[PDB]
């Protein structure tokens, strides 16, 4: 049937990129004007690049970096670019789990601290959500006050780091301690039975979806979610966010799908897997968007404010809407523990794979010094120790702004499109899209349609290049919560994170040509020759020509 096939592919597609990132990127970019580029990218580059990464991984049986070594010795810097991207992602991504751990710890009491605002951290302008319309014109919300004046202690700006938050600092250590021990002891990403680690996130989502859709104001929120705005489409930013939100959700361009695809058998039909997993992953984001955008509709009518100004147009919308949802449920404390355990579980499985993803890449990149044993065990703590130290800048009072810089630049925006464009440029144009099908029809048993070939050859390069050009022409600098303008150096620092990964592609190109000897035309030609991509003879595998 189909349930066994769904059980076969497990439930690792859903992550924090679906329940935390997509809700606020859609919220930041107006309403439904995010969905049009979202689906355009999903069906033009998202699924095509995802299947391309999986099919290369299973074609070469090689990880993130060595796969490019086999496919095209030139442009091999895509692996190192993916390594830098995943390193910065690991640095700033566990901060979300630190926030989730802090929320979970604070939820272990009789009364949820963010239900009412009568505590020390609350601004005198706070008013209860019910009392805002039941009876200094701007009145802030008790949920927002907990997030900004307790969890974040937001400082006037990124130029005011303030004092390190010790309560958050320990929480950032605990998740790294959890991540350190699990990776070092070889613990599987999903613990014991995978059923609980997979069905529980869905079970809580339907609980939140049912509550959200039943809320009195949910009608307005869904209209905001779905009905698009043509004017917002002219902005090149919404195409940057939607294009890379697909890439973030699918964990492509990170070198993780290629490693995941390397374990598939040569005669395995991954095409149905990628199509199913892609639709399930994006289908969750669209469906879970209904849950969170229904709460905002209820929140907006409760406070008598616009939907676009009811919450934070940045990270922490899932830490503002979802904690608000669990407050309007029977036994609110019980659901808050469950949601933030689900939120913690979803991040941990993603972080276990990615941190081990680079650690496996890093040790294999530099052997003879990272031997499996006393050398690897100290290395695992080394990566975690350094990633914890760089992650400590996002724990300070002004750490929220640094987190937004990393979210916008480190593993999103132009850096992700830079890798995705070069993956499709090498395969479709240098290697040849037709040459890849000759492998695929041998591999999955049947040659696919012309969708994939006409997506790597034209659609993805046009989408990636077109977004990059118009973002530079209509350059709008990054802002946090649509009211804070970043200092010029901060954008320069943010661009360095994007440039550090992007510069890997041209730098390795220079390195390879200088290393090789001979005529330049022969030199570049030699580095463009695939080193027997599928050299495996263990399985009934045909030769590349
Ligand atoms: C590209 C250049 C010209 C931009 C302008 C930089 C100049 C104006 C200098 C003057 C004062 C400087 C700031 C002084 C103190 C700190 C606190 C530290 O924790 C982070 C850097 C930060 C925030 C500095 C950033 C750079 C800064 C703003
Ligand atoms: C009296 C006052 O503070 N009014 C503000 C208003 O200027 C602002 O547009 C609105 C939305 O942020 O919040 C309120
Ligand atoms: C539009 C980009 C064209 C790039 C041409 C690459 C040709 C690859 C030849 C490989 C010979 C082994
Ligand atoms: C031959 C491999 C060279 C890879 C270089 C990676 C550069 C990463 C850091 C970018 C500048 C800080
Ligand atoms: C040492 C390198 C000498 C060659 C420099 C590049 C020449 C490129 C010519 C391209 C003609 C199509
Ligand atoms: C909008 C859906 C686009 C699908 C293109 C054709 C699919 C062929 C079979 C996967
Ligand atoms: C390393 C942080 C400072 C870098 C400033 C120069 C880079 C500007 C990129 C646009
Ligand atoms: C091989 C890349 C390791 C991490 C480099 C990070 C540079 C900012
Ligand atoms: C009475 C408050 C209990 C909070 C426990 C966890 C603190 C991070
Ligand atoms: C037309 C693009 C202008 C960008 C200016 C950026 C200065 C920090
Ligand atoms: C390569 C893009 C240029 C951005 C300039 C930003 C300067 C702070
Ligand atoms: C609503 C946009 C759809 C794009 C093609 C699937
Ligand atoms: C925009 C998606 C196109 C898929 C069919 C060529
Ligand atoms: C529909 C009433 C119950 C709300 C929580 C699911
Ligand atoms: C109060 C019931 C509303 C149902 C909306 C799906
Ligand atoms: C792309 C979403 C369309 C919803 C109905 C206009
Ligand atoms: C929250 C429901 C998820 C459904 C994915 C197909
Ligand atoms: C208008 C409510 C739609 C719900 C889809 C899951
Ligand atoms: C920059 C994150 C740590 C790499 C060793
Ligand atoms: Cl997504």
Swiss-Prot record:
Description of post-translational modifications: Taurine transport activity is down-regulated upon Ser-270 phosphorylation.
Keyword entries, A-Z: Cardiomyopathy, Cell membrane, Disease variant, Glycoprotein, Membrane, Neurotransmitter transport, Phosphoprotein, Symport, Transmembrane, Transmembrane helix, Transport
PROSITE patterns cross-referenced by the UniProt entry: NA_NEUROTRAN_SYMP_1, NA_NEUROTRAN_SYMP_2, NA_NEUROTRAN_SYMP_3
Extracellular-side positions: 98-165
Database matches in InterPro entries: Na/ntran_symport, Na/ntran_symport_taurine, SNS_sf
Cystine connections: none
GO MF term list: alanine transmembrane transporter activity; amino acid transmembrane transporter activity; amino acid:sodium symporter activity; gamma-aminobutyric acid transmembrane transporter activity; gamma-aminobutyric acid:sodium:chloride symporter activity; taurine transmembrane transporter activity; taurine:sodium symporter activity
Catalytic activity: 4-aminobutanoate(out) + chloride(out) + 2 Na(+)(out) = 4-aminobutanoate(in) + chloride(in) + 2 Na(+)(in); taurine(out) + chloride(out) + 2 Na(+)(out) = taurine(in) + chloride(in) + 2 Na(+)(in); beta-alanine(out) + chloride(out) + 2 Na(+)(out) = beta-alanine(in) + chloride(in) + 2 Na(+)(in); hypotaurine(out) + chloride(out) + 2 Na(+)(out) = hypotaurine(in) + chloride(in) + 2 Na(+)(in)
Pfam short name (any one): SNF
Regulation: Taurine transport activity is stimulated by thyrotropin. Taurine transport activity is inhibited by GABA, hypotaurine and beta-alanine.
Residues the record marks as carrying a glycan: 118, 134, 138
Similarity comment: Belongs to the sodium:neurotransmitter symporter (SNF) (TC 2.A.22) family. SLC6A6 subfamily.
Purpose: Mediates sodium- and chloride-dependent transport of taurine. Mediates transport of beta-alanine. Can also mediate transport of hypotaurine and gamma-aminobutyric acid (GABA). Sodium-dependent taurine and beta-alanine transporter. Chloride ions are necessary for optimal uptake.
Name under which the protein is recorded: Sodium- and chloride-dependent taurine transporter
Gene source species: Homo sapiens
